[PDB]
Each structure stands twice: as C-alpha cells, then as structure tokens.
Ligand binder design. Structure first.
Ligand code: QCW
Length: 115
C-alpha cells in the first residue's frame, strides 16, 4: 500500500524539492543531486570536516519514506546540504556560487509556505 498523503505544508516542500531537481535549475543544482563522492572527487578530508552529509536524492528518499514529520525538519536537511558546501569549500569556489543560487531559489519559495 501507499504512504498516506503529505500534510499541506509537506506538499509545498515536495513542490520545492521537485523544482530544485528540475531541468530549470540544472546548471547550478547538479552538484547537490547525489551524495558527495569524496573518494571520486579526491576530497580525502571531506568526511573529517563534514560530519552530516546531505544531498537532494537523500531529501527525496526521506520525503517518499515520510521521514520528515513537518516542513521544519525538511528545511533543516536542505539548509544542512548548503551549510556543508559553505563549510567545506572556500567562499570563491564555483560550487559555492552554485549553492548560493540554488539556496536563493529554495529560501524564496520556502517563504511562500501556506498557513
Ligand atoms: C556539494 N558539492 C561539493 O561540496 C563539491 C566540492 C568540491 C567539488 N565539487 C565538484 C564541483 C562542483 C561544481 C564546480 C566544480 C566542482 C563539489 O561538488
């Protein structure tokens, strides 16, 4: 059987998540699609610096599995993903410019939460 329907606030969160994964934002969202493969990227200090990795595929799996009990829990994972990028990478890195752009998409639409 299916999972019960997302709450109204979590429907809005799922909408945002679909947008962040959509071809619309692919030019700057792609680094966030899958877990950072630290070994593949040569980032052999990544897991010493980032204790709680997060990425959009993990957020999608957690939404599908009803792991998130409210919008706040969802938003915390999306912000963790951005914070990890801002912690690990120097502020003038191309990936940080991409994070700032995708976070602007996220924060402005998250602000339109129904209540
Ligand atoms: C969330 N991703 C990262 O923190 C990350 C750190 C270092 C390198 N890369 C690859 C990359 C992306 C974009 C431009 C250049 C290189 C990452 O994705």
């Amino acid at each position: 059987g299916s999972m019960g329907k997302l709450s109204e606030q979590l429907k809005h969160c799922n909408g945002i998540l679909k947008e962040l994964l959509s071809k619309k934002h692919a030019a700057y969202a792609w680094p966030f699609y899958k877990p950072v493969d630290a070994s593949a990227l040569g980032l052999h200090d990544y897991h010493d610096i980032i204790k709680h990795p997060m990425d959009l595929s993990t957020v999608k799996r957690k939404m599908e599995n009803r792991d998130y009990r409210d919008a706040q829990e969802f938003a915390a994972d999306v912000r963790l993903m951005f914070s990890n990028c801002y912690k690990y990478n120097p502020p003038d890195h191309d990936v940080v410019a991409m994070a700032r752009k995708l976070q602007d998409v996220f924060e402005f639409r998250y602000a339109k939460m129904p209540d």
